[PDB]
Amino acid sequence: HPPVVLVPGDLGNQLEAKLDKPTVVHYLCSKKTESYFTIWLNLELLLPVIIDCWIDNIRLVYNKTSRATQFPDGVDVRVPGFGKTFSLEFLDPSKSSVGSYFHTMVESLVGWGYTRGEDVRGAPYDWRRAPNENGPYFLALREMIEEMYQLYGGPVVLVAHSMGNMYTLYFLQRQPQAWKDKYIRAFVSLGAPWGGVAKTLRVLASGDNNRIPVIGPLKIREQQRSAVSTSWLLPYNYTWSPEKVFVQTPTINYTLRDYRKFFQDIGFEDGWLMRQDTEGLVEATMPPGVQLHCLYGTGVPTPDSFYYESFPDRDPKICFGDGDGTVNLKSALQCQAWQSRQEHQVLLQELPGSEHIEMLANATTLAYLKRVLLGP
Ligand SMILES: *[P@@](=O)(CCCCCCCCCCC=C)OC(C)C
Ligand SMILES: *[C@@H]1O[C@H](CO)[C@@H](O)[C@H](O)[C@H]1NC(C)=O
Ligand SMILES: *[C@@H]1O[C@H](CO)[C@@H](O)[C@H](O)[C@H]1NC(C)=O
Ligand SMILES: *[C@@H]1O[C@H](CO)[C@@H](O)[C@H](O)[C@H]1NC(C)=O
Numbered sequence: 001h002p003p004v005v006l007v008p009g010d011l012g013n014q015l016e017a018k019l020d021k022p023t024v025v026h027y028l029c030s031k032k033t034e035s036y037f038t039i040w041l042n043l044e045l046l047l048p049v050i051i052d053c054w055i056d057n058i059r060l061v062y063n064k065t066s067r068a069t070q071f072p073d074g075v076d077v078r079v080p081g082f083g084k085t086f087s088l089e090f091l092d093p094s095k096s097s098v099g100s101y102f103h104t105m106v107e108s109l110v111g112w113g114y115t116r117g118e119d120v121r122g123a124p125y126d127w128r129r130a131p132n133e134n135g136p137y138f139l140a141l142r143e144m145i146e147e148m149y150q151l152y153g154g155p156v157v158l159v160a161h162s163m164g165n166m167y168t169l170y171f172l173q174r175q176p177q178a179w180k181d182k183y184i185r186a187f188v189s190l191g192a193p194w195g196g197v198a199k200t201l202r203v204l205a206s207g208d209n210n211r212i213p214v215i216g217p218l219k220i221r222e223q224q225r226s227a228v229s230t231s232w233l234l235p236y237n238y239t240w241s242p243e244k245v246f247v248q249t250p251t252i253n254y255t256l257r258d259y260r261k262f263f264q265d266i267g268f269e270d271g272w273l274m275r276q277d278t279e280g281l282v283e284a285t286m287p288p289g290v291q292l293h294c295l296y297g298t299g300v301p302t303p304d305s306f307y308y309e310s311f312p313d314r315d316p317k318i319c320f321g322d323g324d325g326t327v328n329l330k331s332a333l334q335c336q337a338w339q340s341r342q343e344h345q346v347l348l349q350e351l352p353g354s355e356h357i358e359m360l361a362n363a364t365t366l367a368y369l370k371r372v373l374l375g376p
């Protein structure tokens with residue numbers, strides 16, 4: 001069986017922080033830690049009041065001079081478990097089911113004879129950033145793929161979920177064809193937001209507390225806007241009509257050609273700078289140049305557009321289209337476009353009734369991956 005590298009999505013691996021902060025926003029926030037603690041995922045940090053401590057640690061500071069993000073004064077954030085699976089199997093190191101992400105899939109892989117940290121390895125990254133600020137990650141990923149090729153005697157299967165598919169495409173677009181033909185067996189693409197997702201507009205405008213209803217959407221908006229990855233996943237014109245309205249208000253519409261106005265009108269000009277930094281990273285048309293299995297959920301209501309009676313500090317009414325509840329179905333068109341642009345096979349696989357996250361623990365998804373890895 002071929003070696004496997006797992007690439008997670010946004011929020012898709014643990015992050016750890018170490019503190020030596022000059023000040024804090026509440027007295028009950030820790031100023032200083034002697035070692036790293038888990039900043040994602042730890043539910044006790046997301047309770048009312050305490051979450052102000054968390055936001056102040058996990059937010060990125062955008063520097064207009066350097067056109068780059070930095071951690072707040074006296075904060076370090078690191079990615080544990082690179083080359084291992086623990087940090088993307090469980091987002092919560094207490095291993096509560098709430099943080100269960102790749103765990104079911106890795107249990108299946110190990111059942112099929114894989115070994116954690118050996119011929120199955122994770123490629124976790126700082127998912128708050130876009131690829132322009134994860135250079136070292138891609139060098140480490142190249143080196144790990146080469147090492148696994150050398151140890152286990154064969155090219156590797158990349159398995160990516162959600163935004164991990166965009167990270168993986170960015171990586172493959174920048175490796176020579178000869179390198180990919182040697183080192184990459186296949187790319188199994190799970191719930192890939194090719195061309196971005198509509199849901200980013202609402203996150204940036206009014207915030208999204210859907211998975212944390214005790215906290216105010218305007219409070220979590222501060223953190224969600226600070227993540228470059230959010231602006232990176234705004235809809236692109238290679239998937240969506242430039243005339244498609246994502247946000248309607250009483251006085252103005254916003255299509256994907258209106259992002260500069262959008263960022264001005266929501267009071268977040270840094271987001272426009274982030275979109276300029278990141279919009280060109282993934283080449284619109286250029287396929288990965290490897291055997292590609294495009295698995296996408298359908299039949300789950302998926303936010304498509306937003307109507308705001310009051311903008312931007314109130315929840316909108318939501319208009320839904322087809323998809324997996326997160327990734328719009330239109331994202332799958334991109335796979336179809338690649339059939340005619342690369343010699344390697346592009347196989348499309350609809351997962352009807354498969355929700356974005358549940359598809360990672362779903363018997364039909366795992367049965368598909370098993371056929372790819374162990375053969376007929
Ligand atoms: P995927 O990687 C793609 C879905 C993109 C939706 C972006 C919204 C941002 C959420 C909070 C922002 C804070 C960092 O999806 C994962 C698996 C959920
Ligand atoms: C912003 O970036 C530049 C270059 O790294 C530097 O002059 C400055 O220290 C940074 N600003 C802040 C507030 O950290
Ligand atoms: C498509 O989007 C890119 C930037 O993301 C833009 O530069 C380009 O002009 C657009 N092309 C159109 C609308 O024809
Ligand atoms: C936005 O366009 C919609 C249809 O796309 C239209 O009904 C509405 O009048 C427009 N809004 C504004 C403020 O022009």
Ligand SMILES: *[C@@H]1O[C@H](CO)[C@@H](O)[C@H](O)[C@H]1NC(C)=O
Pocket residue numbers: 350351352353354355358362363364365
């Ligand atoms: C698992 O995915 C399949 C394939 O689309 C789907 O039919 C089924 O509803 C899913 N199971 C669950 C529990 O969601």
